Design a protein around this ligand. Structure first.
Ligand SMILES: Nc1nc2c(ncn2[C@@H]2O[C@H](COP(=O)(O)OP(=O)(O)NP(=O)(O)O)[C@@H](O)[C@H]2O)c(=O)[nH]1
Ligand SMILES: [Mg+2]
Lengths: 1001, 208, 127, 17
């Protein structure tokens, strides 16, 4: 029954409309859902705009009039110029009249703010179409009607605010460059009159709602108007005094003064400098006397969250930081301005104690600006000594967790570290004193807590490298000594676990100290080794992260023979490795072995390095040897989940060590390589035999997932070594041939759901590093993975996402390093290669789309480098316009805006080939064009026809002017892109001006 | 005690997935573009009594926009969503905010950067500053890993109720009823049980 | 001088972290229902044991039912750390409704221990 | 290195003993 309004052969029943609307906004459940679908269909009727003048006159529902204006909005922005000129004047007239009559009825003006704002925006859309060329008296008449009524004057400030927004703040995306400039110049020409009205209202007016609406418009004006309207008038005085006292006007006025602090200003005039000082002086004065004194506890105020306090304190932080970052030098020399300078910063100190993550980051950014300047600028830091001393405490007490998963906490820690490092350089003594004092109150329990000891330990660790080695040594000693005593002072593994971790974090941050005190460094490591036996949650993971963290920095001191030692300490670590790691989880054992590989790589004697490597790998190599013996004996053992897990952990240990050692890992790799690939084959057979006997569901089972883990870690190990190898002859002559024989056929002949995407990733690295040396191997890779992978991913954009990504990474590196492989493809396979590139264009997936566009660009360059030869001539004849049209399609379909830049680059390269005569053969067929026609003429002809059928609502003149500008600008990417954007605007509407494409000229 | 909440942002940013997680606990992997709007009541239990959100989950794709800003009428709070793996979605945040505060001139608004579970983050933390001058709360969130997935509603509840100490509390757990098998449904439940057993559980590699 | 839940009558027999799934038969798809603490609660006035599971942060109930002696924990084809079983009356989301649940844990040890406690509690309720 | 630190840190391993 509600679907009656969707029948236009009959008169629209307004009462039926108001019912559908009410059911949608106030209803619920099914009735709401039904009405919603009816309203959507009504609004999208291309004739629904004709019935808007009826709704706005005879409806009693504001939501219905709002929807009516939305229907008008679509019509004005997309099809205005298609109407008869009588409807344009009519629509204009009854939008103007509707606004006038809403402002005159004080009851409607008060209770229908949403519908009036919607009408003002609708009017603004008309202005963008019709003003000033077809409405030169709009601004003069607006200024006249403002004096006849406070309500109309207030509403005209809303109209001007919205106009300024649409012309200056949101025009870049929504208009052509020519149209944007036209309107910006039009508003600039008549602003002298607009400012006069605005300034008179502010100086004389008393209606607070009128004042606030005028200041909200001023906020938009300040984005673009010249500074003279601000400094050659009394408006700065008004903002910084009068309007800072009223809480109604205070919020907007403060935002206005923040923008004023960003105006383009000549930095050499002394009167202006005084004016900039003065409005800051007035503003701080009004805050101290009308809002709160500089001693006020803003942390407590913000937490109470009364009224708009939180917004005001946010806006004050933005104002103070913006002004001071630009102008604080104006306050630093004159002694009579010193109190103002420091009161402003004391407010920022108080603001910095607020518990609000994002506000703290705003003030922290300013503090960075300040302490960095005091670090380099002569004679400045003594001014801020008391500010800096308070800041040291604020930052130490609000220090956040370093990475030692939250990526918002990692960025903030590094920001805090930066400022605190600067603050330490500025006064090392004050920083040390605060930290020791803070540590004393951890020991007397007055401030003891898990949060407070962690925060202090992070702060202490963050300033590493700022003190002198002698002070650092005294400092580190006191801290560790005090922290160790704090550990005994506590009971319970929970307390002793917190303090233990903090102690190890601090020592891990001062490697300079550890490197100079061997006996200490040694004892530290031994404690970690004993902490690897403590089963308490977190200890073992801590012990291991600290060990490898210390090793990365102090590795040299583990590989040499230290005084009073009979062997390099690495040997002692390796001897007791089974005992040390006996209680660790697999992940933690691998980190340990990785840390040992870091040390071993410091030994540059090949013979001793390989011996250490052999000893480190003794345990996994003996387990390996044992399995390879019995695993081949009874291949069913690999169905034993215990053997599978053991194997996977042995391989993961080799991956860990290979990650640290890279090229030095080759000896160990050769020990397992040939038997590892045999294992890869045996595991493969079982996966295949399991899927044959159980179906595809077998791939989800723990048995098969464990078997595939083996294959994946084997590929990761080979990938890890090859990507770091320095001896590429051995890679090619020893590694590649057994590898390809082991993985390629297995990948090709498995069903889609059993193929490992890691094979593709592994091959990508092989091609990357030695691609130039195995042209036959690359060909073999394409034959085995290309067609069977493409058929997996060319039916939709969702299935096999990992294969999708790795597939185009592989084609990309093959196209870079061994383009000859594609020249060998049969014509039908090269056609699939082209199809696959364009298929990548159409992905929203960024991983795929970007590579697809790069492959296309690189392919064009590869072809071009071939010169005038048959293969290049045939490529252009077969695929030039396919790439041009496919590229144009994603440029204009509105679903691939993330790739605009690279689409534009590809299109500019394609167009420039024809206009530099880099294509030797005609791109047309003998028949369709006269003999001797230039490819330029045919290109513009093809594109003109292509765009005419794809965008039939464009005029032939538009298309012609767009292409003329586009081809003329194919050597200037920024201008090229601007012309494409202009085209993307014009295709959204009817009647685009073809001269807009002459903007660059 | 029900407040209208409008949820806006570019298509594919996770708005519907985010709401679904709060409604049923599930994580939807498929991208089925919202058509116009989808309204769902959402209730939270707090130390100040229960609060109800009438969530208007709108469409981000232009071709499915429906009534567009007509959905914002008389909203009392809002969430703007973008995708930290897609710069374009953050570039469009000022456009969604513009269209929103033109209809809802003074409401609490949360800005959410979704999908921080994805390693290859493209909109870095340092680049997200739009919320400062607009007085929006900001949260990194992931509807997949549940990182900060409750913060947007906790903050909004505290603004709508006017109590900065409002907390989510555990809804009461009534005693569950006693069970009695129906012999006329035994073979019916053992059928659906066999299908459930032989359907693999998703994300078997997740930590839980 | 003058100066200025509903599970308290119960007892926690077992607690474990787990993720709960429900089977959408009409879509042949497991769907998550909540991740949090799964508890076996013994009522002091009836000695009857129930499962009570709440989501993290929001603390909303995602499982609330008796550990009936009739229920039977079954393995899932793709998991060595989960159990599948049918539930004929769960009241986490309003009225009593029947579900085919799946619960997964952090390790195979928690899975077997859960089944151990799950069976101990079944005998408790049989009385 | 200060010799009293050693005495305190050598007991560090036995913190959990
Ligand atoms: N990795 C990840 N994916 C997510 C996350 N949230 C949502 N998604 C995924 O992103 C895709 C889009 O989900 P969706 O909720 O429909 O986004 P939307 O904003 O509602 N789209 P529309 O505005 O067109 O209705 C889905 O595949 C979803 O699984 C997340 O937090 N992390
Ligand atoms: Mg959606």
């Amino acid at each position: 029954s509600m679907e009656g309004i969707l029948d236009f052969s009959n008169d629209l029943d307004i009462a039926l409309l108001d019912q559908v609307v009410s059911t949608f906004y106030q209803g619920s459940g099914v009735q709401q859902k039904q009405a919603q679908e009816i309203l959507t269909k009504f609004q999208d009727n291309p004739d629904a705009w004709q019935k808007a003048d009826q709704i706005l006159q005879f409806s009693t529902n504001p939501q219905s009039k709002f929807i009516a204006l939305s229907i008008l909005d679509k019509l004005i922005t997309r099809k205005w110029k298609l109407l008869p000129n009588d409807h344009r004047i009519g629509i204009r007239n009854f939008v103007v009249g509707m606004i006038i009559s809403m402002c005159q009825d004080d009851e409607v003006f008060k209770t229908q703010k949403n519908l009036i704002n919607k009408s003002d925006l609708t009017l603004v859309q008309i202005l963008k179409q019709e003003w000033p060329q077809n409405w030169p008296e709009f601004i003069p008449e607006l200024i006249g009607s403002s004096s006849s009524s406070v309500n109309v004057c207030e509403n005209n400030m809303i109209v001007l605010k919205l106009l300024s927004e649409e012309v200056f703040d949101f025009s870049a995306e929504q208009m052509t460059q020519a149209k944007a400039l036209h309107l910006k110049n039009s508003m600039s020409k008549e602003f002298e009159q607009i400012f006069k009205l605005c300034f008179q209202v502010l100086e004389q007016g008393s209606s607070s709602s009128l004042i606030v609406a005028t200041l909200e418009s001023l906020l938009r004006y300040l984005h673009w108007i010249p500074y003279r309207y601000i400094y050659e008038t009394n408006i700065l005085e008004l903002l910084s005094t009068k309007f800072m006292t009223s809480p109604d006007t205070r919020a907007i006025t403060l935002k206005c003064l923040t923008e004023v602090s960003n105006l383009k200003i000549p930095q050499d005039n002394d009167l202006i400098k005084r004016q900039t000082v003065l409005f800051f002086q007035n503003t701080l004065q009004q805050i101290a006397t009308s809002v709160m004194p500089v001693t006020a506890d803003l942390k407590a105020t913000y937490a109470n969250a009364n009224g708009n306090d939180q917004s005001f304190l946010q806006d004050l932080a933005m104002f103070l930081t913006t002004y001071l970052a630009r102008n604080r030098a104006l306050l630093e020399s004159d002694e009579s301005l010193r109190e103002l300078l420091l009161n402003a910063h004391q407010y920022l100190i108080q603001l910095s104690k607020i518990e609000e993550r994002e506000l703290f980051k705003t003030t922290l950014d300013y503090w960075h600006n300040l302490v960095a300047d005091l670090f380099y600028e002569p004679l400045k830091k003594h001014i801020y000594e008391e500010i800096c001393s308070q800041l040291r405490l604020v930052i130490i007490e609000n220090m956040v967790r370093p990475e030692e998963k939250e990526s918002d906490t990692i960025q903030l820690y590094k920001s805090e570290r930066e400022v605190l490092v600067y603050l330490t350089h500025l006064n090392v003594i004050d920083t040390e004193e605060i930290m020791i004092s803070k540590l004393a109150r951890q020991i007397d329990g007055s401030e003891w807590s898990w949060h407070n000891i962690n925060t202090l330990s992070w702060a202490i660790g963050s300033i590493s490298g700022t003190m002198s080695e002698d002070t650092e040594k005294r400092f580190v000693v006191t801290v560790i000594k005090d922290l160790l005593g704090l550990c005994e002072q506590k009971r319970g593994k929970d307390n002793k676990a917190v303090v233990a971790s903090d102690i190890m974090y601090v020592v891990g941050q001062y490697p300079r100290f550890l490197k100079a005190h061997w006996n200490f460094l040694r004892t530290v490591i031994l404690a970690l080794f004993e902490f690897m036996h403590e089963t308490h949650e977190g200890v073992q993971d801590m012990a291991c992260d600290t060990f490898i963290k210390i090793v990365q920095k102090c590795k040299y001191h583990f590989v040499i023979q230290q005084p009073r030692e009979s062997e390099p300490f690495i040997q002692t670590i390796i001897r007791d490795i089974q005992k040390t790691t006996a209680d660790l989880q697999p992940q933690q054992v691998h980190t340990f072995y990785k840390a040992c590989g870091i040390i071993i790589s410091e030994e540059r004697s090949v013979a001793e390095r390989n011996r250490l490597l052999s000893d480190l790998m003794q345990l996994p190599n003996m387990a390996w040897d044992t399995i390879v013996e019995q695993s081949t004996a009874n291949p069913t053992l690999l169905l034993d989940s215990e053997t599978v897990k053991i194997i996977a952990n042995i391989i993961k240990t080799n991956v860990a060590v290979c990650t640290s050692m890279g090229a030095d890992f080759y000896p160990q790799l050769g020990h397992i390589y040939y038997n590892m690939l045999q294992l890869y084959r045996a595991v493969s057979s079982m996966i295949s035999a399991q899927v044959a006997a159980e179906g595809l569901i077998a791939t989800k089972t723990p048995k098969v997932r464990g078997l595939r883990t083996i294959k994946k870690e084997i590929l990761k190990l080979v990938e890890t070594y090859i990507s770091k190898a320095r001896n590429l002859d051995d890679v090619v002559k020893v590694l590649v041939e057994p590898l390809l024989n082991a993985v390629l056929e297995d990948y090709m002949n498995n069903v889609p759901d059993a193929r490992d995407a890691e094979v593709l990733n592994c091959m990508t690295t092989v091609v990357e590093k030695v691609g130039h040396m195995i042209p036959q191997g690359v060909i073999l890779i394409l034959q085995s993975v290309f067609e069977c992978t493409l058929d997996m991913i060319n039916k939709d954009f969702t299935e096999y996402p990992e294969h999708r990504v790795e597939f185009y990474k592989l084609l990309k590196v093959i196209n870079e390093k061994s383009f000859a492989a594609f020249l060998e493809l049969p014509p039908a396979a090269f056609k699939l290669f082209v199809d696959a590139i364009c298929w990548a264009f159409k992905h929203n997936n960024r991983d795929v789309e970007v590579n697809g566009l790069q492959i296309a660009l690189d392919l064009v360059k590869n072809i071009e480098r071939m010169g005038n030869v048959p293969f290049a001539n045939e490529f252009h004849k077969n695929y030039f316009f396919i790439f041009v049209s496919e590229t144009f399609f994603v440029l204009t379909d509105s679903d691939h805006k993330s790739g605009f830049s690279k689409q534009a680059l590809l299109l500019m390269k394609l167009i420039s080939l024809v206009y530099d005569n880099k294509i030797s053969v005609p791109l047309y067929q003998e028949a369709e064009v006269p003999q001797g026609t230039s490819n330029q003429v045919y290109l513009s002809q093809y594109l003109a026809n292509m765009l005419s059928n794809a965008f039939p609502h464009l005029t032939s003149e538009q298309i012609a002017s767009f292409l003329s500008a586009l081809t003329k600008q194919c050597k200037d990417l920024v201008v090229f892109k601007g012309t494409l954007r202009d085209f993307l605007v014009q295709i959204k509407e009817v009647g685009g001006d073809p001269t807009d494409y002459l903007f660059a000229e | 005690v029900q407040f209208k909440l409008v949820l806006v942002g570019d298509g594919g940013t996770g708005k519907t997935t985010f709401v679904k997680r709060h409604l049923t606990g599930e994580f939807e992997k498929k991208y089925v573009a919202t058509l116009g709007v989808e309204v769902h009541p959402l209730v939270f239990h707090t130390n100040r009594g229960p609060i109800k959100f009438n969530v208007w989950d709108t469409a981000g794709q232009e071709k499915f926009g429906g009534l567009r800003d007509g959905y914002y009428i008389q909203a009392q709070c809002a969430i703007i969503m973008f995708d930290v793996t897609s710069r374009v979605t953050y570039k469009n945040v000022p456009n969604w905010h513009r269209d929103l505060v033109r209809v809802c001139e003074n409401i609490p608004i949360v800005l959410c950067g979704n999908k921080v579970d994805i390693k290859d983050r493209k909109v870095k933390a340092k680049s997200i500053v739009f919320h400062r001058k607009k007085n929006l709360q900001y949260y990194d969130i992931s509807a997949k890993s549940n990182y900060n997935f409750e913060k947007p509603f906790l903050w909004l509840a505290r603004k709508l109720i006017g109590d900065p100490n409002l907390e989510f509390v555990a809804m009461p757990a009534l005693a569950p009823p006693e069970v009695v098998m129906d012999p006329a449904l035994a073979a019916q439940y053992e059928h659906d049980l066999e299908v459930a057993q032989t359907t693999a559980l998703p994300d078997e590699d997740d930590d839980l | 001088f003058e100066p200025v839940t509903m599970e308290e009558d119960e007892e926690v027999l077992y607690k474990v972290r787990a993720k709960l799934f429900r089977f959408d038969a009409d879509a042949k798809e497991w769907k998550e229902r909540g991740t949090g603490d799964c508890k076996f609660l013994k009522n002091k006035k009836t000695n009857k044991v129930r499962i009570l599971m709440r989501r993290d942060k929001t603390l909303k109930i995602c499982a609330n039912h008796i550990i009936a002696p009739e229920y039977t924990l079954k393995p899932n084809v793709g998991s060595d750390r989960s159990w599948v079983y049918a539930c004929t009356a769960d009241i986490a989301e309003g009225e009593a409704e029947a579900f085919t649940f799946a619960i997964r844990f952090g390790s195979k040890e928690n899975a077997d221990k859960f089944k151990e406690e799950f069976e101990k509690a079944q005998e408790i309720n049989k009385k | 290195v200060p010799k009293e630190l050693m005495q305190q840190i050598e007991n560090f391993e036995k913190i959990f003993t």
